[PDB]
Amino acid sequence: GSSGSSGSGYVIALRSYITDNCSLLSFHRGDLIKLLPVATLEPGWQFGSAGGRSGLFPADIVQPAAAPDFSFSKEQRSGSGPSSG
Protein backbone atom coordinates (compact mmCIF):
# COMPACT_ATOMS: atom_id res chain seq x y z
CA GLY A 1 0.00 0.00 0.00
CA SER A 2 1.80 3.08 -1.31
CA SER A 3 0.98 6.40 0.35
CA GLY A 4 3.74 8.82 -0.61
CA SER A 5 2.52 9.82 -4.06
CA SER A 6 5.69 11.81 -4.72
CA GLY A 7 9.24 10.59 -4.16
CA SER A 8 12.43 12.41 -3.20
CA GLY A 9 15.86 11.67 -1.76
CA TYR A 10 18.78 14.08 -1.75
CA VAL A 11 21.56 14.26 0.84
CA ILE A 12 24.64 16.46 1.17
CA ALA A 13 28.09 15.45 2.42
CA LEU A 14 28.91 17.01 5.78
CA ARG A 15 32.56 15.92 5.74
CA SER A 16 35.14 14.68 3.23
CA TYR A 17 35.13 10.90 2.89
CA ILE A 18 38.30 9.94 1.01
CA THR A 19 38.25 6.30 -0.10
CA ASP A 20 40.96 4.20 -1.75
CA ASN A 21 38.53 1.61 -3.11
CA CYS A 22 35.88 1.21 -5.80
CA SER A 23 33.13 -0.43 -3.74
CA LEU A 24 32.99 2.65 -1.51
CA LEU A 25 32.26 6.22 -2.62
CA SER A 26 34.71 9.12 -2.65
CA PHE A 27 33.41 12.66 -2.14
CA HIS A 28 34.18 15.93 -0.36
CA ARG A 29 32.28 18.10 2.13
CA GLY A 30 29.30 19.53 0.28
CA ASP A 31 29.23 17.15 -2.68
CA LEU A 32 25.55 16.21 -2.91
CA ILE A 33 24.99 12.45 -3.07
CA LYS A 34 22.00 11.48 -5.21
CA LEU A 35 20.09 8.60 -3.61
CA LEU A 36 19.98 5.81 -6.20
CA PRO A 37 17.31 3.07 -6.23
CA VAL A 38 18.50 0.00 -4.33
CA ALA A 39 16.79 -3.27 -3.44
CA THR A 40 18.14 -3.58 0.10
CA LEU A 41 20.86 -1.91 2.17
CA GLU A 42 22.50 -2.25 5.59
CA PRO A 43 21.66 -0.44 8.85
CA GLY A 44 23.94 2.57 8.49
CA TRP A 45 25.26 2.19 4.95
CA GLN A 46 23.89 4.23 2.05
CA PHE A 47 23.93 3.79 -1.73
CA GLY A 48 24.02 6.60 -4.27
CA SER A 49 26.00 8.60 -6.82
CA ALA A 50 28.12 11.72 -6.30
CA GLY A 51 28.49 12.70 -9.94
CA GLY A 52 29.95 9.85 -11.96
CA ARG A 53 31.21 7.23 -9.51
CA SER A 54 28.96 5.06 -7.35
CA GLY A 55 29.78 3.60 -3.95
CA LEU A 56 28.59 2.89 -0.41
CA PHE A 57 28.97 5.77 2.04
CA PRO A 58 28.17 5.97 5.78
CA ALA A 59 24.89 7.58 6.86
CA ASP A 60 26.66 9.20 9.81
CA ILE A 61 28.52 11.83 7.79
CA VAL A 62 25.71 12.96 5.50
CA GLN A 63 22.60 15.07 6.09
CA PRO A 64 19.28 15.38 4.21
CA ALA A 65 18.67 18.39 1.97
CA ALA A 66 15.82 19.72 -0.17
CA ALA A 67 15.69 18.53 -3.79
CA PRO A 68 16.98 20.76 -6.62
CA ASP A 69 13.76 19.99 -8.49
CA PHE A 70 10.34 21.55 -7.88
CA SER A 71 7.08 19.80 -8.77
CA PHE A 72 4.18 22.20 -9.30
CA SER A 73 1.30 21.86 -6.84
CA LYS A 74 -1.92 23.57 -5.73
CA GLU A 75 -1.38 26.97 -4.11
CA GLN A 76 -1.79 26.23 -0.40
CA ARG A 77 -4.12 28.59 1.47
CA SER A 78 -2.70 31.32 3.71
CA GLY A 79 -3.53 31.67 7.39
CA SER A 80 -7.15 32.77 7.60
CA GLY A 81 -6.60 34.57 10.90
CA PRO A 82 -7.58 32.97 14.22
CA SER A 83 -9.19 35.37 16.70
CA SER A 84 -9.29 33.22 19.83
CA GLY A 85 -5.75 32.74 21.10
Short mmCIF file of all heavy atoms in Angstrom, two decimals, residues 15-48:
data_model
loop_
_atom_site.label_atom_id
_atom_site.label_comp_id
_atom_site.label_asym_id
_atom_site.label_seq_id
_atom_site.Cartn_x
_atom_site.Cartn_y
_atom_site.Cartn_z
N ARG A 15 31.10 15.98 5.63
CA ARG A 15 32.56 15.92 5.74
C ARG A 15 33.16 15.14 4.58
O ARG A 15 32.47 14.35 3.92
CB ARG A 15 32.96 15.27 7.07
CG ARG A 15 32.26 13.96 7.34
CD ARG A 15 33.10 13.04 8.21
NE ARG A 15 32.93 13.33 9.63
CZ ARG A 15 33.59 12.69 10.59
NH1 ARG A 15 34.46 11.74 10.29
NH2 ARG A 15 33.38 13.01 11.87
N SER A 16 34.44 15.36 4.32
CA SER A 16 35.14 14.68 3.23
C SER A 16 35.38 13.22 3.58
O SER A 16 35.94 12.90 4.63
CB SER A 16 36.46 15.38 2.93
OG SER A 16 37.45 15.04 3.90
N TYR A 17 34.96 12.33 2.68
CA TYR A 17 35.13 10.90 2.89
C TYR A 17 36.03 10.29 1.81
O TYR A 17 35.54 9.68 0.86
CB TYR A 17 33.78 10.19 2.90
CG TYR A 17 33.81 8.82 3.53
CD1 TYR A 17 34.10 8.66 4.88
CD2 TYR A 17 33.55 7.68 2.77
CE1 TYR A 17 34.13 7.40 5.45
CE2 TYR A 17 33.58 6.42 3.34
CZ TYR A 17 33.87 6.29 4.68
OH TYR A 17 33.90 5.04 5.25
N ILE A 18 37.33 10.47 1.97
CA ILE A 18 38.30 9.94 1.01
C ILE A 18 38.38 8.42 1.09
O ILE A 18 38.60 7.85 2.16
CB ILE A 18 39.70 10.53 1.23
CG1 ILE A 18 39.64 12.06 1.26
CG2 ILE A 18 40.66 10.05 0.15
CD1 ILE A 18 39.23 12.67 -0.06
N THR A 19 38.20 7.76 -0.05
CA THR A 19 38.25 6.30 -0.10
C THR A 19 39.25 5.83 -1.15
O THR A 19 39.36 6.42 -2.23
CB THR A 19 36.86 5.70 -0.42
OG1 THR A 19 36.39 6.19 -1.68
CG2 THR A 19 35.86 6.05 0.67
N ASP A 20 39.97 4.76 -0.84
CA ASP A 20 40.96 4.20 -1.75
C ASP A 20 40.46 2.90 -2.37
O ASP A 20 41.24 2.02 -2.70
CB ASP A 20 42.28 3.96 -1.02
CG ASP A 20 42.09 3.25 0.30
OD1 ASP A 20 41.44 3.83 1.20
OD2 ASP A 20 42.58 2.11 0.45
N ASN A 21 39.14 2.80 -2.53
CA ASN A 21 38.53 1.61 -3.11
C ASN A 21 37.43 1.98 -4.09
O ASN A 21 37.04 3.14 -4.19
CB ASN A 21 37.96 0.71 -2.00
CG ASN A 21 39.04 0.15 -1.10
OD1 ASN A 21 39.48 0.80 -0.15
ND2 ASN A 21 39.48 -1.07 -1.39
N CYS A 22 36.93 0.99 -4.82
CA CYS A 22 35.88 1.21 -5.80
C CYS A 22 34.50 0.97 -5.18
O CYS A 22 33.56 1.73 -5.42
CB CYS A 22 36.07 0.30 -7.01
SG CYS A 22 37.49 0.73 -8.04
N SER A 23 34.39 -0.09 -4.39
CA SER A 23 33.13 -0.43 -3.74
C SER A 23 32.56 0.77 -3.00
O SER A 23 31.36 1.06 -3.09
CB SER A 23 33.34 -1.59 -2.76
OG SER A 23 33.71 -2.78 -3.45
N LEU A 24 33.41 1.48 -2.27
CA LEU A 24 32.99 2.65 -1.51
C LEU A 24 32.88 3.87 -2.42
O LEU A 24 33.23 3.81 -3.60
CB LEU A 24 33.97 2.93 -0.37
CG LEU A 24 34.29 1.75 0.54
CD1 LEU A 24 35.69 1.89 1.12
CD2 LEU A 24 33.26 1.64 1.65
N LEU A 25 32.41 4.98 -1.86
CA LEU A 25 32.26 6.22 -2.62
C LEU A 25 33.20 7.29 -2.10
O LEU A 25 33.40 7.43 -0.89
CB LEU A 25 30.81 6.71 -2.55
CG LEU A 25 30.53 8.06 -3.21
CD1 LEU A 25 30.81 7.99 -4.70
CD2 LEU A 25 29.09 8.49 -2.96
N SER A 26 33.79 8.06 -3.01
CA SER A 26 34.71 9.12 -2.65
C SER A 26 34.13 10.49 -2.98
O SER A 26 33.84 10.79 -4.14
CB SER A 26 36.05 8.93 -3.37
OG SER A 26 35.98 9.39 -4.70
N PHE A 27 33.96 11.32 -1.96
CA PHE A 27 33.41 12.66 -2.14
C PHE A 27 33.95 13.62 -1.08
O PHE A 27 34.57 13.20 -0.10
CB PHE A 27 31.88 12.62 -2.08
CG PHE A 27 31.35 12.21 -0.74
CD1 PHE A 27 31.51 13.03 0.37
CD2 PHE A 27 30.69 11.00 -0.58
CE1 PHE A 27 31.02 12.65 1.61
CE2 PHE A 27 30.19 10.62 0.65
CZ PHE A 27 30.36 11.45 1.75
N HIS A 28 33.72 14.91 -1.29
CA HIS A 28 34.18 15.93 -0.36
C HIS A 28 33.00 16.53 0.41
O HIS A 28 31.85 16.18 0.18
CB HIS A 28 34.93 17.03 -1.10
CG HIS A 28 36.31 16.63 -1.53
ND1 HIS A 28 37.37 17.51 -1.57
CD2 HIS A 28 36.80 15.43 -1.93
CE1 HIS A 28 38.45 16.87 -1.98
NE2 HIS A 28 38.13 15.61 -2.21
N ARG A 29 33.31 17.45 1.33
CA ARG A 29 32.28 18.10 2.13
C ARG A 29 31.45 19.05 1.28
O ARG A 29 31.94 20.08 0.82
CB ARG A 29 32.92 18.86 3.29
CG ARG A 29 31.94 19.74 4.05
CD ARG A 29 32.48 20.12 5.43
NE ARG A 29 33.35 21.29 5.37
CZ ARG A 29 33.84 21.89 6.45
NH1 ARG A 29 33.55 21.44 7.66
NH2 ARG A 29 34.64 22.95 6.32
N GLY A 30 30.18 18.69 1.08
CA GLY A 30 29.30 19.53 0.28
C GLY A 30 28.79 18.81 -0.96
O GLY A 30 27.69 19.09 -1.43
N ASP A 31 29.60 17.90 -1.49
CA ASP A 31 29.23 17.15 -2.68
C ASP A 31 27.93 16.37 -2.45
O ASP A 31 27.92 15.36 -1.74
CB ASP A 31 30.35 16.18 -3.07
CG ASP A 31 31.49 16.89 -3.78
OD1 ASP A 31 31.22 17.77 -4.61
OD2 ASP A 31 32.66 16.55 -3.49
N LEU A 32 26.85 16.85 -3.05
CA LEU A 32 25.55 16.21 -2.91
C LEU A 32 25.59 14.78 -3.44
O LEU A 32 26.12 14.52 -4.52
CB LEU A 32 24.47 17.01 -3.65
CG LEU A 32 23.04 16.81 -3.17
CD1 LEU A 32 22.18 18.01 -3.53
CD2 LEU A 32 22.45 15.53 -3.75
N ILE A 33 25.02 13.85 -2.68
CA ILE A 33 24.99 12.45 -3.07
C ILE A 33 23.58 12.01 -3.43
O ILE A 33 22.75 11.77 -2.56
CB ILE A 33 25.53 11.53 -1.96
CG1 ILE A 33 26.97 11.93 -1.59
CG2 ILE A 33 25.47 10.08 -2.39
CD1 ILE A 33 27.35 11.57 -0.17
N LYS A 34 23.32 11.89 -4.73
CA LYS A 34 22.00 11.48 -5.21
C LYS A 34 21.68 10.06 -4.75
O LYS A 34 22.45 9.13 -4.97
CB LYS A 34 21.95 11.55 -6.74
CG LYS A 34 20.56 11.31 -7.31
CD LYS A 34 20.62 11.00 -8.80
CE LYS A 34 19.24 10.73 -9.36
NZ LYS A 34 18.73 9.39 -8.96
N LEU A 35 20.52 9.91 -4.11
CA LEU A 35 20.09 8.60 -3.61
C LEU A 35 19.58 7.73 -4.76
O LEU A 35 18.49 7.97 -5.29
CB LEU A 35 19.00 8.77 -2.55
CG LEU A 35 19.43 9.43 -1.24
CD1 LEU A 35 18.27 9.50 -0.27
CD2 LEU A 35 20.60 8.68 -0.63
N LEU A 36 20.36 6.72 -5.12
CA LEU A 36 19.98 5.81 -6.20
C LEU A 36 19.08 4.70 -5.68
O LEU A 36 19.12 4.34 -4.51
CB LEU A 36 21.23 5.21 -6.84
CG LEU A 36 22.13 6.18 -7.61
CD1 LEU A 36 23.42 5.50 -8.03
CD2 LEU A 36 21.40 6.74 -8.82
N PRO A 37 18.24 4.15 -6.57
CA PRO A 37 17.31 3.07 -6.23
C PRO A 37 18.03 1.76 -5.95
O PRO A 37 18.71 1.21 -6.81
CB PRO A 37 16.44 2.95 -7.48
CG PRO A 37 17.29 3.46 -8.59
CD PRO A 37 18.14 4.54 -7.99
N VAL A 38 17.87 1.26 -4.73
CA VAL A 38 18.50 0.00 -4.33
C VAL A 38 17.48 -0.96 -3.73
O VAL A 38 16.54 -0.54 -3.06
CB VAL A 38 19.63 0.24 -3.31
CG1 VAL A 38 19.11 1.04 -2.12
CG2 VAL A 38 20.23 -1.08 -2.85
N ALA A 39 17.69 -2.25 -3.97
CA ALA A 39 16.79 -3.27 -3.44
C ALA A 39 16.81 -3.30 -1.92
O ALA A 39 15.78 -3.11 -1.27
CB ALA A 39 17.16 -4.64 -4.00
N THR A 40 17.99 -3.53 -1.35
CA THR A 40 18.14 -3.58 0.10
C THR A 40 19.53 -3.11 0.52
O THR A 40 20.52 -3.37 -0.16
CB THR A 40 17.90 -5.00 0.64
OG1 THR A 40 17.59 -4.95 2.04
CG2 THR A 40 19.13 -5.87 0.42
N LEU A 41 19.59 -2.42 1.65
CA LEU A 41 20.86 -1.91 2.17
C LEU A 41 21.07 -2.35 3.61
O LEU A 41 20.26 -3.08 4.18
CB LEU A 41 20.90 -0.38 2.08
CG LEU A 41 21.36 0.20 0.74
CD1 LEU A 41 21.05 1.68 0.67
CD2 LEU A 41 22.85 -0.05 0.54
N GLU A 42 22.18 -1.90 4.21
CA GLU A 42 22.50 -2.25 5.59
C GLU A 42 22.14 -1.10 6.53
O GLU A 42 22.00 0.05 6.12
CB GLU A 42 23.98 -2.60 5.72
CG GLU A 42 24.28 -4.07 5.50
CD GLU A 42 24.05 -4.50 4.06
OE1 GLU A 42 22.87 -4.63 3.67
OE2 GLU A 42 25.04 -4.72 3.34
N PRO A 43 21.99 -1.43 7.82
CA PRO A 43 21.66 -0.44 8.85
C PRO A 43 22.80 0.53 9.13
O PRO A 43 23.59 0.32 10.05
CB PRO A 43 21.37 -1.30 10.09
CG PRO A 43 22.15 -2.55 9.87
CD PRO A 43 22.14 -2.78 8.38
N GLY A 44 22.89 1.58 8.32
CA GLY A 44 23.94 2.57 8.49
C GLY A 44 24.62 2.92 7.19
O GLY A 44 25.14 4.02 7.03
N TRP A 45 24.63 1.97 6.25
CA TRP A 45 25.26 2.19 4.95
C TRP A 45 24.26 2.76 3.95
O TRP A 45 23.07 2.44 4.00
CB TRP A 45 25.84 0.88 4.42
CG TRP A 45 27.07 0.44 5.15
CD1 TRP A 45 27.15 -0.48 6.16
CD2 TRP A 45 28.41 0.90 4.92
NE1 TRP A 45 28.45 -0.62 6.57
CE2 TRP A 45 29.25 0.21 5.82
CE3 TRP A 45 28.98 1.81 4.03
CZ2 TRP A 45 30.62 0.42 5.87
CZ3 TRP A 45 30.35 2.02 4.08
CH2 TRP A 45 31.16 1.33 4.99
N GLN A 46 24.75 3.61 3.06
CA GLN A 46 23.89 4.23 2.05
C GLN A 46 24.43 3.96 0.64
O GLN A 46 25.62 3.70 0.46
CB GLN A 46 23.79 5.74 2.29
CG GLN A 46 23.04 6.10 3.56
CD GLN A 46 21.54 5.99 3.40
OE1 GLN A 46 20.98 4.89 3.39
NE2 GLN A 46 20.87 7.12 3.26
N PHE A 47 23.55 4.03 -0.35
CA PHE A 47 23.93 3.79 -1.73
C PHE A 47 23.44 4.92 -2.63
O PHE A 47 22.26 5.25 -2.65
CB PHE A 47 23.36 2.45 -2.22
CG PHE A 47 23.79 2.09 -3.61
CD1 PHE A 47 25.10 1.71 -3.87
CD2 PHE A 47 22.89 2.13 -4.66
CE1 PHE A 47 25.50 1.37 -5.14
CE2 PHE A 47 23.29 1.80 -5.95
CZ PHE A 47 24.59 1.41 -6.19
N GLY A 48 24.37 5.51 -3.38
CA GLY A 48 24.02 6.60 -4.27
C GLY A 48 25.18 7.05 -5.13
O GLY A 48 26.27 6.47 -5.06
#
